[PDB]
Amino acid sequence: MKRTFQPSVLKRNRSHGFRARMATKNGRQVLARRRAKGRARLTVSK
């Protein structure tokens, strides 16, 4: 309903993606951060 979260799988892959964020320079700082932190969990980048 008024719930903040409820799944839309598409959007995750295409807005929070590996390559749906790689283009922007800033969403390459994110990758850089989360690689050197040892982060490799992946927030749905597949």
* Residues with Cβ within 8 Å of residue 22, at least 6 apart in sequence: 28, 31
> Is 8 among the residues that bind RNA (CB under 7 A)?
yes
Binding-site residue total for RNA (CB under 7 A)? 9
Q: Which residue is it, tokens 């799944």? A: 7
Part in contact with RNA (CB under 7 A); list of ranges 8-16, 22-30, 36-44: 8-16
Contact 43, 16 (CB under 8 A): yes
> Is 36 among the residues that bind RNA (CB under 7 A)?
no
Residues that bind RNA (CB under 7 A): 2-5, 8, 10-11, 14-15
